[PDB]
């Protein structure tokens, strides 16, 4: 208990960051306080609280958490962090409506002593912020900011850093947002994370991580990125003879090491680690869940890969009912929830949870991953909320950095998931060590000129089901939209997709046709998937679209006139 106070509980200084802020924007309070409490992270011992109310009656009850503030430097390849002064205590606000804003902060510990603040008025302004994410209740496979234009996630998994810790987030993440990335997933654990809350302890989280993790979010907020943040993985809770990276020997959780836990089954069910897993949830939402650029709590990477010994789907399913229920209670900003299997068609009795608002697919397959993507986006439509493909790879194994440095298996399968009814674009792994060394970051940047000026909430867009190919001597394929408004098009090539040794394609002539079930007259624009560009246009009185020479895909926009 090295953060423990042993005195009458006072506070004794309270900073406020400005009295006048933006909608959306950042509110925070500094209070500097003594108490009696051994543990600062845990609410029974010490528990402060920002409560707020608008002009319009709305209130907001915002825990607050225990923060120590670093200086970071960088020591020949690796950051390592100063602590300046001594810690304290934060709450982070964000107003989502303007006007005037009444605020007091209380504290109570473990005497039960209990003291308040007065109050505070802070005045809001609108800003540019677009709001919070939310599932789109005009397409539910889809997702809306708050003031209601459409977020389609594109990017990648950047999900820790190397030694050099957040000086690395400082070259990927502006690398990405300038090529039309607006997303990436972080991790919280395991403990070897660069986030890691649960470093060496469950009970008390690592206040050196959890500035980073700041960082990170206070850089993708000047990005206009958004990240999901995934709390713990299946390593935790994986023994080391099963291998797959296995942790649970090292972990806290574990009683060997501190922990509550005598074997990883007892996770979902012990009353202590369900407490400290609660107390742990309630840090998270106190320090970021003011923040609009969280896309997403996540629970778990791969929870169905955890030990086979501790998997117990009904005990893991009423698990995540009862966490969701709490997190959603506890978050005043209401984000969204969601987790993930290994398993690539996942876990129906979880994925239909009503807590959990959208499902996820991992998938590393090397042969035919085209057509397996859209069997599986056509499949989990049946939980009518939206699907994210949250990883994707040719091989968990890593074979993609030595067989495809172009990236085209990256290329095939952003392409596929958008044009398929995907949330957003398949989020590949291995961003230290193939996106960003390969520069493969033009990729993105052509999905994303290609889809950003399509309203995706209100096309009705569906699977492209009633085509007829023309095409003599050559295998060409189809993904597809028809929308209201729009049909996107996505050609490859079946016999040139997946070959990977041509250097990045580098088109007069005709190849063949392709015949829709639309109405004339239309407008029909080419598209160089690789340099991001128009290739032609054309004017249509009927309804065959030519399609022109290239070399392994080609996309079409078609406007219906």
């Given at each position: 208990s090295r953060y423990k106070d042993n005195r009458p509980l006072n506070i004794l200084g309270i900073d406020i960051s400005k009295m006048e802020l933006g909608r959306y924007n950042l509110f925070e309070v500094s209070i500097f306080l003594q108490g009696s409490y051994l543990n600062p992270f845990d609410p029974q011992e010490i528990d402060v609280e920002g409560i707020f109310e608008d002009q319009y009656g709305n209130q907001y009850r915002v825990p607050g958490f225990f923060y120590q503030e670093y200086k970071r430097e960088l020591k020949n390849d690796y950051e390592y962090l100063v602590p300046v002064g001594d810690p304290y205590f934060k709450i982070r606000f964000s107003p989502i409506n303007i006007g005037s804003y009444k605020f007091f902060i209380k504290v109570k510990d473990k005497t039960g002593r209990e003291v308040s603040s007065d109050k505070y008025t802070i005045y809001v302004k609108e800003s540019e912020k677009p709001g919070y994410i939310r599932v789109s209740e005009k397409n539910w496979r889809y997702f809306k900011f708050d003031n209601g234009r459409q977020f389609l996630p594109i990017g990648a998994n950047i999900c820790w850093a190397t030694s050099k810790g957040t000086y690395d987030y400082d070259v990927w993440l502006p690398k990405c947002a300038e090529n039309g990335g607006n997303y990436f997933r972080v991790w919280l654990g395991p403990s070897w994370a660069t986030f890691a809350l649960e470093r060496e302890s469950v009970k008390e989280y690592d206040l050196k991580n959890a500035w980073k993790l700041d960082y990170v979010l206070n850089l993708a907020e000047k990005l206009n990125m958004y990240i999901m943040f995934c709390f713990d993985s299946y390593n935790e809770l994986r023994y080391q003879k099963e291998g797959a990276y296995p942790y649970w020997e090292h972990t806290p959780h574990y009683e060997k090491n501190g922990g509550p836990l005598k074997e990883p089954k007892d996770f979902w069910t012990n009353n202590e680690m369900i407490k400290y897993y609660k107390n742990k949830l309630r840090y998270i939402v106190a320090r970021?869940?003011?923040?609009?650029?969280?896309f997403a709590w996540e629970f778990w990477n791969e929870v169905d890969i955890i030990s086979p010994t501790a998997f117990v789907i009904g005990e893991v399913k009423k698990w995540h009912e009862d966490m969701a229920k709490y997190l959603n209670s506890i978050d005043p900003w209401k984000h969204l929830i969601t987790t993930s299997f290994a398993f690539s068609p996942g876990k129906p009795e979880i994925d239909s949870i009503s807590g959990l608002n959208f499902v996820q697919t991992h998938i590393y397959k090397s042969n035919r991953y085209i057509d397996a993507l859209l069997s599986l986006i056509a499949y989990k439509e049946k939980y009518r909320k939206p699907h994210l493909v949250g990883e994707f790879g040719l091989d968990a194994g890593g074979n993609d950095l030595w067989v495809d440095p172009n990236g085209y298996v990256i290329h095939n399968a952003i392409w596929t998931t958008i044009l398929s009814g995907a949330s957003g674009t398949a989020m590949s792994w291995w961003w230290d060590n193939h996106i960003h060394p390969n520069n493969l970051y033009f990729h993105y940047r052509a999905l994303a000129d290609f889809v950003k000026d399509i309203n995706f909430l209100e096309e009705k867009f569906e699977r492209l089901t009633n085509y007829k190919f023309n095409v003599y001597n050559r295998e060409i394929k189809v993904i597809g939209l028809q929308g209201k408004k729009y049909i996107l098009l996505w050609l490859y090539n079946a016999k040139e997709a997946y070959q990977y040794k041509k250097d990045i394609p580098n088109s007069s002539k005709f190849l063949g046709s392709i015949e829709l079930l639309i109405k004339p007259p239309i407008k029909v624009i080419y598209y160089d998937?690789?340099?991001?560009?128009?290739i032609k246009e054309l004017d249509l009185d009927k309804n065959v679209i030519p399609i022109i020479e290239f070399e392994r895909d080609l996309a079409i926009k078609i406007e219906l006139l």
């Amino acid at each position: 208990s090295r953060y423990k106070d042993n005195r009458p509980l006072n506070i004794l200084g309270i900073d406020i960051s400005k009295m006048e802020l933006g909608r959306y924007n950042l509110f925070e309070v500094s209070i500097f306080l003594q108490g009696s409490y051994l543990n600062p992270f845990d609410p029974q011992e010490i528990d402060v609280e920002g409560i707020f109310e608008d002009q319009y009656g709305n209130q907001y009850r915002v825990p607050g958490f225990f923060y120590q503030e670093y200086k970071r430097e960088l020591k020949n390849d690796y950051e390592y962090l100063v602590p300046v002064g001594d810690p304290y205590f934060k709450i982070r606000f964000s107003p989502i409506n303007i006007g005037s804003y009444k605020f007091f902060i209380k504290v109570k510990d473990k005497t039960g002593r209990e003291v308040s603040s007065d109050k505070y008025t802070i005045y809001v302004k609108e800003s540019e912020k677009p709001g919070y994410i939310r599932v789109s209740e005009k397409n539910w496979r889809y997702f809306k900011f708050d003031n209601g234009r459409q977020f389609l996630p594109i990017g990648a998994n950047i999900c820790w850093a190397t030694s050099k810790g957040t000086y690395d987030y400082d070259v990927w993440l502006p690398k990405c947002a300038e090529n039309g990335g607006n997303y990436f997933r972080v991790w919280l654990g395991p403990s070897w994370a660069t986030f890691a809350l649960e470093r060496e302890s469950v009970k008390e989280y690592d206040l050196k991580n959890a500035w980073k993790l700041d960082y990170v979010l206070n850089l993708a907020e000047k990005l206009n990125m958004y990240i999901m943040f995934c709390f713990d993985s299946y390593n935790e809770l994986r023994y080391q003879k099963e291998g797959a990276y296995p942790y649970w020997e090292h972990t806290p959780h574990y009683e060997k090491n501190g922990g509550p836990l005598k074997e990883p089954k007892d996770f979902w069910t012990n009353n202590e680690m369900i407490k400290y897993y609660k107390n742990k949830l309630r840090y998270i939402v106190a320090r970021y869940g003011y923040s609009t650029n969280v896309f997403a709590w996540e629970f778990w990477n791969e929870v169905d890969i955890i030990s086979p010994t501790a998997f117990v789907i009904g005990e893991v399913k009423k698990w995540h009912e009862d966490m969701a229920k709490y997190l959603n209670s506890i978050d005043p900003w209401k984000h969204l929830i969601t987790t993930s299997f290994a398993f690539s068609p996942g876990k129906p009795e979880i994925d239909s949870i009503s807590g959990l608002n959208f499902v996820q697919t991992h998938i590393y397959k090397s042969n035919r991953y085209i057509d397996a993507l859209l069997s599986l986006i056509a499949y989990k439509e049946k939980y009518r909320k939206p699907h994210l493909v949250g990883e994707f790879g040719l091989d968990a194994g890593g074979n993609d950095l030595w067989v495809d440095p172009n990236g085209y298996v990256i290329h095939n399968a952003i392409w596929t998931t958008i044009l398929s009814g995907a949330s957003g674009t398949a989020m590949s792994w291995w961003w230290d060590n193939h996106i960003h060394p390969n520069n493969l970051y033009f990729h993105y940047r052509a999905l994303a000129d290609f889809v950003k000026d399509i309203n995706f909430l209100e096309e009705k867009f569906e699977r492209l089901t009633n085509y007829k190919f023309n095409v003599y001597n050559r295998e060409i394929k189809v993904i597809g939209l028809q929308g209201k408004k729009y049909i996107l098009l996505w050609l490859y090539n079946a016999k040139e997709a997946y070959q990977y040794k041509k250097d990045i394609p580098n088109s007069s002539k005709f190849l063949g046709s392709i015949e829709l079930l639309i109405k004339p007259p239309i407008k029909v624009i080419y598209y160089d998937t690789y340099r991001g560009e128009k290739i032609k246009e054309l004017d249509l009185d009927k309804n065959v679209i030519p399609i022109i020479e290239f070399e392994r895909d080609l996309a079409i926009k078609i406007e219906l006139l």
